[PDB]
Design a protein around this ligand. Structure first.
Ligand SMILES: CC(C)(c1ccc(O)cc1)c1ccc(O)cc1
Ligand SMILES: CC(C)(c1ccc(O)cc1)c1ccc(O)cc1
Lengths: 271, 13
């Protein structure tokens, strides 16, 4: 009652912070995907010719010295994925710092929570930019088809497919940005990450976030039976996605060569 | 060795 009102205020705080931290929300992405926006339509990359035609227009200007390079397509795309992941880590870090209690945690525990939580959040939020046929890229300026990503040479063609599989099922839950803001906060505040020094304050924050999430889902999805339990299971599923992803990367580190990995991702993947 | 995540966490607006 008094507790419930504070849980709504927390939910709203998190939503407002999510809006401040993440430029491309699910609402804005869905409008683009469905075609209900007045903005310019994304450039569709569905084959090698359209990749060539669109890549200079939508890629980041300062990934390489000259922007033109001799690396094969699959690696160029992988480098673009890294740049996007690095930006996402920075957005997620800013959001985490808005979660009440987070910045007062031991700083090494803040690091651990981000290190072991950011990829679960990346894949959650990637679903907002996906449908069964492709993914929005470059802040919504491009759309790369799932089939084209699958067509990439053996190692790289398998990177995104598990994320599309997750996204199609996750998107069937019809969460909105308000729901997602709390879900992501719950994931960040996971007290079972390896090497946490003081678990109790993290669990106490998470317990309150979980209560806020349950109330959010009951009010915002009154006809969606067991949605809270479903989201708890998606948290488990995301850990398995990340485990599988790390494995794919280890293969890359063995079979592939001349593989630059951004230092921020090197830190996250270490051990 | 130094933590890039720690640097991000410590920067204010
Ligand atoms: C296709 C894309 C514009 C790109 C990025 C970098 C690159 O060198 C060539 C092409 C790209 C790939 C992956 C991505 O996440 C965003 C953008
Ligand atoms: C091209 C590369 C993968 C990259 C990816 C993303 C990025 O923002 C900047 C650079 C890169 C180049 C050189 C390097 O030492 C690490 C990473």
């Amino acid at each position: 009652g008094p507790e419930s009102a504070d849980l709504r205020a927390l939910a709203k705080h998190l939503y407002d912070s999510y809006i401040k931290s993440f430029p491309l929300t699910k609402a804005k992405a869905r409008a683009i995907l469905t075609g209900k926006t007045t903005d310019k339509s994304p450039f569709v990359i569905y084959d090698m010719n359209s990749l060539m035609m669109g890549e200079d227009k939508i890629k980041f200007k300062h990934i390489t010295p000259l922007q033109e390079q001799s690396k094969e397509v699959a690696i160029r795309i992988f480098q673009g994925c890294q740049f996007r992941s690095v930006e996402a880590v920075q957005e997620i870090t800013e959001y985490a710092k808005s979660i009440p209690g987070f910045v007062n945690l031991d700083l090494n525990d803040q690091v651990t929570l981000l290190k072991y939580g950011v990829h679960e959040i990346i894949y959650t939020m990637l679903a907002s930019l996906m449908n069964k046929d492709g993914v929005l890229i470059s802040e919504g300026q491009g759309f790369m088809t799932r089939e084209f990503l699958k067509s990439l040479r053996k190692p790289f063609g398998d990177f995104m497919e598990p994320k599309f599989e997750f996204a199609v099922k996750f998107n069937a839950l019809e969460l909105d940005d308000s729901d997602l803001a709390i879900f992501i906060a719950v994931i960040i505040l996971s007290g079972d990450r390896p090497g946490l020094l003081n678990v109790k304050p993290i669990e106490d924050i998470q317990d309150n976030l979980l209560q806020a999430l349950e109330l959010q889902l009951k009010l915002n999805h009154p006809e969606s039976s067991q949605l809270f339990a479903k989201l708890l299971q998606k948290m488990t599923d995301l850990r398995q996605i990340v485990t599988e992803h790390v494995q794919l990367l280890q293969v890359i580190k063995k079979t592939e060569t001349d593989m630059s990995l951004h230092p921020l991702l090197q830190e996250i993947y270490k051990d | 060795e130094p933590s890039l995540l720690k640097k991000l966490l410590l920067a204010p607006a």
